């Protein structure tokens with residue numbers, strides 16, 4: 211049957227949750243809603259419960275709620291945030307107004323683990339491996355993260371890592387094409403980010419700590435060189451081309467000297483991730499097979515996602531339609547094993 215709910219005032223609204231979730235304590239809040247830590251008596255897990263704010267206030271809010279719930283329900287992988295539970299106190303669609311999402315309580319992100327220090331090479335292999343493993347899965351669903359950074363990487367005390375699309379400096383890890391509003395993005399935009407994160411774990415220093423947009427791009431070109439002919443022939447914007455040919459030629463730096471001291475296999479991998487031309491960057495699948503990850507790579511335990519129907523993105527529906535579709539997704543949810 212339906213669980214027994216209780217009501218408690220938290221973050222200035224009445225939260226109504228199943229009695230399995232105990233000891234709600236706010237962690238934080240913002241425009242999106244707010245989040246309480248709780249204990250799930252049923253599973254023995256520490257969890258985070260998020261009450262969405264204004265989920266159906268407008269067409270756009272409603273479609274965003276639907277998008278969020280669909281994504282969360284589809285993501286079932288150890289290195290990606292997933293859903294333990296979703297609930298509403300409403301007993302019918304007619305009563306449906308509030309959506310609550312439940313996931314594992316997370317207490318630290320990659321910045322907290324790193325502390326601007328060098329990590330050991332073995333530690334970097336393990337962390338980067340997990341990121342790539344999660345990215346293979348995400349990319350296999352025809353999804354691109356687009357803003358992968360340390361603040362979106364949760365890590366527990368066993369340094370098990372999960373990719374998030376939220377947080378628990380902002381542009382230092384972005385692909386250069388993303389910062390130049392290129393569109394037509396490749397999934398390897400995320401691989402650029404992995405390269406920036408990996409470099410920083412090894413060296414203890416941000417790779418491209420630009421002061422602003424143009425400075426970021428200047429630091430990038432100084433390392434990887436100015437665009438070569440092969441890259442230039444794929445640029446359709448006549449302003450971008452003539453600006454690019456007008457810059458002084460700079461060669462690609464010698465990565466072996468830049469990251470001197472590093473495992474030469476790490477250097478090799480960085481050379482394959484941090485390529486300006488997104489078409490020539492290594493994929494997540496290819497990177498998992500790279501010799502750097504030999505102690506962790508298991509081709510039979512690097513799973514891919516089921517096909518992910520994102521056709522709803524192209525649709526323009528009424529608020530009550532998005533609301534109804536969301537309600538269907540709440541009611542049909544089956545918790546993980």
Ligand SMILES: CCc1nc(-c2cccc(C)c2)c(-c2ccnc(NC(=O)c3ccccc3)c2)s1
Nearest residue numbers: 237258259260311312313314315316317376378
């Ligand atoms: C958009 C903003 C956020 N959303 C969630 C969240 C919560 C439940 C379900 C889902 C899908 C996301 C967040 C979440 C999820 C899990 N753990 C946390 N934990 C924390 O924020 C945290 C931070 C410091 C100390 C202790 C705890 C937050 S943060």
Ligand SMILES: CCCCCCCCO[C@@H]1O[C@H](CO)[C@@H](O)[C@H](O)[C@H]1O
Nearest residue numbers: 387392394395396444486487488489
């Ligand atoms: C002056 C700085 C130049 C930055 C060049 C970035 C090149 C990124 O690479 C480009 O990505 C596009 C997808 O986004 C693809 O369509 C192109 O084929 C690919 O070359």
